[PDB]
């Protein structure tokens, strides 16, 4: 059952990248797995380099922990930053030097939809506090697919849109009063957008919650540990009820509890 976030566990490290190209990246499982994948299927994308086009796939968690992909997908265009998600058999990612979200069906290796996110800043315009090109952050929660961004119209405040997963049409949009560049990262749980205060502190907090049901925000002080002091990616998986994160070469999870 859904509820507000009340607790975040301490990070558990599943894999440590062995090259500097893995200092930051995105890794994830599918909260709505579809044949031929399972809830154990894992994807991993190192994103420090240029021309990021290869997506590593692991059919078993033990393969992921040992660093041995079972498949490698080649994307037809390059991918930007750490914000991508997998949902219902597709990778949703941002095209390099663009504000375009691309739907890449993993089993057929085909692009099924593209969508320019209207007004979205990109390429270091509205990054998170972590910097880089973290302007556009996709998210999956219990009700489906979302994208987190900002616009000049919103003057840098986080904008949140719900997306049709088949054709990437924007179904609804909310404008917060939370400055995107002031928070380390963000994610959605049960229709509530949460932000993290710091990418480096061992005593950070989940520090804001914006509820889409009310269109209002509140402060929070839920403790959050950046164990390795450089978190580039923090997302939520509603099937596992865990945060998945990338922190200074380490692919980690945080258990969460809801009220
Ligand atoms: Ca995120
Ligand atoms: K980046
Ligand atoms: Na994301």
DSSP-derived secondary structure for 35-61:
TT--TT-EEEEE-SSSSEEEEEEESSH
Strand partners, 249: none
Domain boundaries, the chain: 1-259
Contact 146, 139 (CB under 8 A): yes
| Rounded Cα–Cα distance for residues 207 and 170 (Å) | 27
Annotated binding site for Ca(2+): which residue ranges?
137, 185-186, 234-235
> What phi and psi, each to the nearest 5 degrees, are found at residue 64?
-60, -45
Query: Method used for this model?
Result: X-ray
Which residue is listed with tokens 């914000």? 83
Q: Which of 164, 41, 168 is nearest to 107 (CA)?
A: 41
Q: Ligand 1 centroid to 138 CA: how many Å?
A: 7
Resolution of this deposited model, Å: 1.6
Hey, CA dihedral for 106, 108, 111, 113, is it positive or negative?
negative
Interval between CA 85 and ligand 3 midpoint (Å): 5
């Amino acid at each position: 059952g859904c509820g507000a976030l009340v607790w975040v566990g301490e990070p558990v490290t599943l894999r440590t990248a062995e090259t500097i190209a893995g200092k930051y990246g995105v890794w994830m499982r599918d909260p709505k797995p579809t044949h031929p994948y399972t809830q154990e299927s894992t994807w991993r994308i190192d994103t420090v380099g240029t021309e990021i086009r290869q997506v590593f796939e692991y059919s078993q968690i033990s393969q992921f922990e040992q660093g041995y992909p079972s498949k490698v997908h080649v994307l037809p265009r390059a991918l930007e930053s750490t914000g991508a998600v997998v949902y219902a058999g597709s990778l949703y990612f941002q095209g390099a030097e663009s504000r375009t979200v691309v739907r890449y069906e993993l089993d057929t290796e085909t692009v099924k939809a593209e969508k320019e996110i209207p007004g979205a800043g990109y390429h270091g315009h509205f990054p998170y506090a972590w910097g880089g090109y973290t302007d556009i952050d996709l998210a999956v929660d219990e009700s489906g697919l979302w994208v987190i961004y900002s616009t000049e119209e919103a003057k840098g405040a986080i904008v949140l849109s719900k997306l049709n997963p088949a054709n990437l049409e924007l179904e609804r949009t909310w404008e917060t009063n939370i400055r995107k560049q002031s928070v380390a990262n963000a994610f959605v749980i049960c229709g509530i957008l949460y932000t993290v205060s710091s990418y480096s502190s061992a005593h950070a907090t989940v520090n804001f919650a914006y509820d889409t049901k009310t269109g209002t925000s509140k402060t929070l002080t839920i403790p959050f540990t950046n164990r390795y002091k450089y978190s580039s990616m923090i997302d939520y998986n509603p099937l596992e009820r865990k945060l998945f994160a990338w922190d200074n070469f380490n692919m980690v999870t945080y258990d969460i509890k809801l009220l």
